[PDB]
Write a protein that binds this DNA or RNA. Sequence first.
RNA 1: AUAU
RNA 2: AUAU
Lengths: 164, 164, 149
Amino acid sequence: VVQPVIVEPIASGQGKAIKAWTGYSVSKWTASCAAAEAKVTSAITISLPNELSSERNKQLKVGRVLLWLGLLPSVSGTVKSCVTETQTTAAASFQVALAVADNSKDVVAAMYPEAFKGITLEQLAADLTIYLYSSAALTEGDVIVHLEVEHVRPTFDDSFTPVY
Amino acid sequence: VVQPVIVEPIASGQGKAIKAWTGYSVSKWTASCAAAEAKVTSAITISLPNELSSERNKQLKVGRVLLWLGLLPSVSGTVKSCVTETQTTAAASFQVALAVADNSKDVVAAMYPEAFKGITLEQLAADLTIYLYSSAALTEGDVIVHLEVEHVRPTFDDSFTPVY
Amino acid sequence: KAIKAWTGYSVSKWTASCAAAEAKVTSAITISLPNELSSERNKQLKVGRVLLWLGLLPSVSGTVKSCVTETQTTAAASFQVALAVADNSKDVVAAMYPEAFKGITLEQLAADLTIYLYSSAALTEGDVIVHLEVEHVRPTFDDSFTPVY
RNA sequence: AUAU
RNA sequence: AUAU
């Protein structure tokens, strides 16, 4: 039997949003890029936001990392990123990366399910780095790297600080 | 209906002792305090006592923490303490302490329920410090700081070191 | 009798080469993880029993000692603290570490502790090969192929 | 073997 | 995600 199918076309914002894990919550930050000459791989350090910085909030567990890449309207060359482990020549990140966000493709993203699981939010901040590459020269703000990280939902959100 | 009540007086030792958590035990150590002039906040590094120093032992997780303050009979000014995250200006500890041991009040202790939870015993020793303030000059020996820490009853000291 | 590993735990064995040093010097060797255990995720694996060998060359004569103990300030002190030391003067040239590193992460093994080597006589690089075997929870990942997109 |  |  041959089922005739019709492919209804989707508009941009219509992708399935991925819900987080029961008892986890996604938080997202942005990292503005550095300036660099063409074909230079730059490193960007993952900086934790603030809420996720107290000693209790730091020990949180991670468990799905999504890499976005919001380059601006006038950029031209190919741009790439990957969140890998701190590499010793930067470019090599791209040779091990389990996923690379390339603007050359339809979706400029990278997802890391089963890759950085069970890591401490602080651990994420320490043994991994974000790498950026572009075949053109970048200026202080062309590529804004979005990092979205799932982690156990915190306990402080639940109470007031006692008094006394 | 109005309930008549009599408030029978408690002497000193008569306070309730707080029991630990099933699967936990409390270790206590003393930290003698160095000398300093009046109105100066000093820093005291939390040093791990020996049982809790081997690597297996170093990773027990922390539960609730209690801070005592045993100052000797000839002291006079106000004395204050707290265990906060290693502050950049010793005196700011007091602006962020969720509990302060002021000797101006009846009980000279500070407890830390729901704060510091889940941290590693080594982490305690690393990213936190004790601060002591007094309105008068101190000499090495007054104000022995007592620190009592809850942690997973160690699996370790349930066996001898092997032979051959 | 060969010691079986634990259910779940598999044993990883790897070597490290001698450093070429002078007589009576306690040198230090850094434990570095073998590539298979090198991913961010594999590093989080928990350690179990750890064993230490000593595969010295047939002509090396003198006493050779080794122990795997927490990173030291004064290398030689390792021996005064080592829960087990490997000698060649003894019938057995091993150091078994039961209950001593039980809850550690492979990552911590590579950071928190080091390997030390003493020899009464001076050594050439490669005179003594060090074998270190670590029980670690079997990595889940070995059962999947890396995705392709 | 055990533990959370 | 797994899986306990």
